[PDB]
Write a structure and sequence with these properties.
binds the ligand Cc1nnn(C)c1-c1cnc2c3ccc(C(C)(C)O)c(F)c3n([C@H](c3ncccc3F)C3CCOCC3)c2c1, globular, cell cycle, Bromodomain-containing protein 4, CAP, 5 helices, BRD4
Length: 108
């Protein structure tokens, strides 16, 4: 719901997630080629990462907060859909999502 919440998502939510030790694989799109993952983009049709979210927040792409929250949803959900439970990347996405939930509770 406009600018204040979107700035809170940039300055508080994204910043806290970005600075976490577990952030680095989510800071840029999944490079399925470098990672030797032939079926990533056969399974994942809507890729999403925090680098893209950061750019969208910085260039006023979003109409409202919820559209940004959907991008965070897509990023966490893609990871859960593609990978097995117990995979390290899933545990990292789960810990980032826990931190995301702690921050979006104080959403103005
Ligand atoms: C998947 C997958 N599903 N959702 N996401 C977000 C990812 C994903 C995205 N980016 C990366 C990534 C980027 C660079 C490098 C190196 C090479 C260090 O520059 C990696 F290693 C990377 N790996 C590893 C990785 N995952 C799967 C297969 C091979 C592989 F290396 C993770 C192995 C477990 O600990 C964390 C990193 C990623 C996994
Ligand atoms: C409640 C509640 N009462 N009725 N309904 C239907 C919901 C409801 C149901 N599903 C979701 C949901 C699913 C995944 C993810 C992530 C984590 C992105 O995958 C969410 F964020 C989600 N949130 C957020 C949310 N709501 C409340 C507390 C935490 C929280 F994150 C909304 C915050 C405002 O913008 C829209 C999403 C939901 C709220």
């Amino acid at each position: 719901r406009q600018t204040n919440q979107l700035q809170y998502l940039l300055r508080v939510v994204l910043k806290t997630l970005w600075k976490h030790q577990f952030a680095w694989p989510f800071q840029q799109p999944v490079d399925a080629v470098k990672l030797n993952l032939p079926d990533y983009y056969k399974i994942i049709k809507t890729p999403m990462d925090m680098g893209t979210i950061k750019k969208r927040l910085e260039n006023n792409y979003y109409w409202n907060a919820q559209e940004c929250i959907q991008d965070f949803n897509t990023m966490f959900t893609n990871c859960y859909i593609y990978n097995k439970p117990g995979d390290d990347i899933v545990l990292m996405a789960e810990a980032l999502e826990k931190l995301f939930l702690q921050k979006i509770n104080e959403l103005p």
